[PDB]
């Protein structure tokens with residue numbers, strides 16, 4: 048105790064969440080199929096782009112849900128989070144472009160945007176009890192994934208990169224210093240904090256942050272029912288199946304990131320249950336939503352289970368690694384999700400001969 052990875056260290060702050068050089072090499076030389084071609088991001092002059100300015104002062108974000116933790120969405124929510132969504136989108140896009148092209152211009156463009164946010168002490172001042180707490184985990188991790196691919200890049204302002212790295216480290220330490228509630232301590236939100244702590248711990252060579260991140264994956268494995276369902280996600284009523292899938296996203300990224308540091312989280316299990324059990328459940332429940340009735344009576348919102356949904360990004364990473372079948376036939380168009388490092392089609396998908 049208190050968990051099996053409590054002595055783990057960051058070996059290589061530049062290792063990112065994929066083998067950057069190997070993948071770029073593959074993208075520039077390999078035998079690409081139609082879907083990988085479709086995933087190639089389009090080059091543009093990012094030096095002339097206007098990027099979102101950070102909120103000055105207090106980060107104030109309305110609750111997502113009108114009431115409780117499900118049902119109709121709050122009308123005031125989306126107009127406010129849009130700024131953050133633009134920030135994430137741009138960040139992930141520039142990260143993906145750097146991987147694909149190796150052009151330092153994309154790295155410099157990312158750093159200038161992040162420097163601007165860092166200067167303003169963004170993602171630091173907020174009520175931990177508000178929606179803002181969640182927004183921080185999503186945006187900070189998104190920026191960190193993109194930055195992680197360019198930690199080895201020599202043609203940038205190294206002082207700027209450092210300044211930006213330090214900033215994200217402060218963000219993550221502050222954000223993860225709050226235990227959360229009865230649910231948020233231990234549900235998908237916990238796992239999102241885990242991915243944030245893991246990737247930021249890597250790039251800032253912060254072993255303590257890294258370990259805390261790995262710990263969240265461990266916590267999750269002990270919260271899987273025998274059918275493979277996550278305990279806390281099965282209480283979300285009509286969003287139950289949605290949140291079961293949603294949990295897969297950061298858990299996968301923690302695993303992928305840790306694998307670059309020589310740790311095999313996928314192999315970790317608790318009572319013979321592992322992340323594979325959870326995958327099987329998602330696939331099985333999408334086919335047969337009577338599986339969910341055991342937990343929730345409302346018909347399930349299945350908006351996430353459509354080709355092209357960001358929500359499926361975790362499948363690209365897992366399938367590349369384990370070679371399982373696309374049972375649902377969702378892996379047709381490319382997938383892009385800033386919050387899990389952009390396009391996992393671009394970064395992980397291997398055409399099968």
Ligand SMILES: O=C(O)C1=C[C@H](O)[C@H](O)[C@H](O[C@H]2[C@H](O)[C@H](O)[C@H](O[C@H]3[C@H](O)[C@H](O)[C@H](O[C@H]4[C@H](O)[C@H](O)[C@H](O)O[C@@H]4C(=O)O)O[C@@H]3C(=O)O)O[C@H]2C(=O)O)O1
Nearest residue numbers: 111112115116178181234235236293350355356357358383
């Ligand atoms: O990927 C797409 O192609 C896509 C297309 C759509 O046009 C639209 O852009 C869509 O937006 C997605 C996307 O993931 C976006 O970030 C947002 O994600 C949601 C999640 O789906 C959850 O609802 C999440 O959960 C928490 C909730 O925020 C609140 O904190 C509550 O108390 O706890 C929840 C929990 O995590 O336990 O919130 C994010 C969000 O960013 O608000 O919306 C989805 C979408 O389907 O609309 O993607």
